[PDB]
Write a protein that binds this ligand. Structure first.
Ligand SMILES: [Ca+2]
Ligand SMILES: [Ca+2]
Ligand SMILES: [Ca+2]
Ligand SMILES: [Ca+2]
Ligand SMILES: [Ca+2]
Ligand SMILES: [Ca+2]
Ligand SMILES: [Ca+2]
Ligand SMILES: [Ca+2]
Ligand SMILES: [Ca+2]
Ligand SMILES: [Ca+2]
Ligand SMILES: [Ca+2]
Ligand SMILES: [Ca+2]
Ligand SMILES: [Ca+2]
Ligand SMILES: [Mg+2]
Ligand SMILES: [Mg+2]
Ligand SMILES: [Mg+2]
Length: 301
């Protein structure tokens, strides 16, 4: 089915191929079948009832390409769906059940739900709204900042943030054995949730990190400012701090280790505020030896 300006058409249970060279200005529903839809323009803000999809890929393993922006809701439905939107997304996107693959080249400012099963989400710009990866072992890669709330849901999820988790932003890894890497700064919040999680912050931390229950490892590579709070939760946790440590840090319950790579024994022994900040840790290693307990060597860092 070929269209320039799409203003409405009926599809069916066949495996459709829909080519739109212009904009989508009515509802588009390719229904059952493994359908392919390609739109060179925008999915427009078509008037529909609350939470109704403008573009519905339906049941089936469907494949969607949009070269422009998405301003009306997309539902990929059931099935293992593949979505590629080059532009910005300002409407809701629901990849549904199935192992879905979602690529958004621009910013995400509508709420995304990857739904059940094991989804791949890639956002070239910022995550400004809700992003729910759902159940399943999900993979989320963000090019720029998180200003909204990312919830990776149950199972063993991976998040990589290319820039900064802003003051308003959160990344909640939830249950499962999750991995987070923030390449910029953490001004908002991160929560590992239950399970044995790995959290790595390359930039500075002024916001909050919770390891949650489980035996977690947190590594911060730049300055931890005074207002920051890093709590490792119950379980047997490790905190590696590669630079200045001004903020509040807690091992909480369990057998907890801290590596202060930036401070030598000489500094530690001459800085009562630093010693008091980290005294709650069972094991404490500094740059040139051990000051408390029996920490691991941490030779990797
Ligand atoms: Ca169809
Ligand atoms: Ca379909
Ligand atoms: Ca589908
Ligand atoms: Ca789906
Ligand atoms: Ca899904
Ligand atoms: Ca999922
Ligand atoms: Ca998940
Ligand atoms: Ca999880
Ligand atoms: Ca977790
Ligand atoms: Ca945890
Ligand atoms: Ca923990
Ligand atoms: Ca602990
Ligand atoms: Ca402890
Ligand atoms: Mg499935
Ligand atoms: Mg931005
Ligand atoms: Mg920024």
């Amino acid at each position: 089915h070929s269209f320039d300006h799409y203003i409405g058409s009926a599809f069916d249970a066949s495996n459709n191929n829909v080519a739109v060279t212009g904009n989508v200005s009515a509802t588009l529903n390719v229904l059952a079948g493994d359908d392919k839809v390609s739109i060179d323009g925008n999915v427009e803000d078509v008037l529909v009832a609350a939470n109704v999809a403008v573009l519905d890929m339906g049941t089936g393993n469907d494949q969607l390409y949009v070269a422009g922006d998405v301003l009306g809701k997309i539902d990929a439905g059931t099935g293992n769906d593949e979505i590629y939107i080059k532009g910005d997304v300002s409407a809701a996107v629901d990849a549904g059940t199935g192992n879905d693959e979602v690529y958004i080249g621009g910013n995400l400012s509508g709420d995304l739900d990857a739904g059940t099963d094991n989804d791949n989400i890639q956002i070239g710009g910022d995550v400004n709204a809700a992003l729910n990866a759902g159940t399943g072992n999900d993979n989320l890669i963000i090019g720029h900042d998180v200003s909204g709330i990312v919830n990776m849901g149950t199972d063993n999820d991976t998040v990589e943030v290319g820039r900064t988790i802003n003051a308003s932003g959160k990344v909640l890894l939830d249950t499962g054995d999750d991995s987070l890497l923030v390449s910029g700064d953490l001004f908002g919040e991160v929560d590992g949730g239950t399970g044995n999680d790995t959290i790595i912050i390359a930039g500075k931390v002024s916001g909050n990190i919770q390891g949650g229950t489980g035996n977690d490892i947190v590594r911060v590579q730049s300055q931890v400012w005074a207002e920051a709070n890093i709590s490792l939760g119950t379980g047997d946790d490790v905190l590696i701090v590669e630079h200045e440590l001004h903020g509040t840090v807690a091992g909480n319950e369990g057998d907890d280790s801290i590596y202060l790579k930036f401070y030598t024994k000489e500094q530690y022994n001459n800085n009562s505020d630093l010693r008091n900040r980290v005294a709650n840790f069972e094991h404490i290693r500094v740059s040139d030896g051990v000051v408390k307990g029996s920490p691991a060597d941490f030779a990797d860092y």
